[PDB]
Design a protein around this ligand. Structure first.
Ligand SMILES: [Mg+2]
Ligand SMILES: [Zn+2]
Ligand SMILES: [Zn+2]
Ligand SMILES: [Zn+2]
Ligand SMILES: [Zn+2]
Lengths: 68, 68
């Protein structure tokens, strides 16, 4: 069981705006390798391109997936 | 960014033992469409068991679980 479903992502924060936890849809990078990962809120996914809050090497060619 | 990576799953609990949050690997159901979802910890996963779920999940042995 997961409380909130995909409406809330505890422990996950947006690497552009810094909201924590991400409320609503979350877009996770799949090619960024750092274990901290790279995530975006739906607003920052829609209006795009920060390099990262924690030294993540996110490139414009990286692909993002919706995290259910 | 997500703290703890795949070593902790905040907001996610095991439907067999009830641990919350799930520490370690987590297995989520692809076919259970209840918003609460269906999840299991790794030891409970690898010891197969009847676990219909704790929140009215209609989880059948035919349902498939993916590592999250
Ligand atoms: Mg607890
Ligand atoms: Zn954002
Ligand atoms: Zn990336
Ligand atoms: Zn368990
Ligand atoms: Zn199921």
């Amino acid at each position: 069981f997961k409380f909130g479903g995909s409406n809330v992502h505890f422990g996950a924060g947006c690497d552009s705006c810094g909201v924590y936890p991400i409320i609503g849809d979350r877009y996770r990078c799949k090619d960024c390798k750092e274990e901290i990962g790279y995530d975006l809120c739906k607003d920052c996914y829609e209006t795009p391109k920060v390099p990262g809050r924690f030294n993540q090497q996110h490139t414009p060619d990286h692909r993002l997936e919706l995290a259910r």
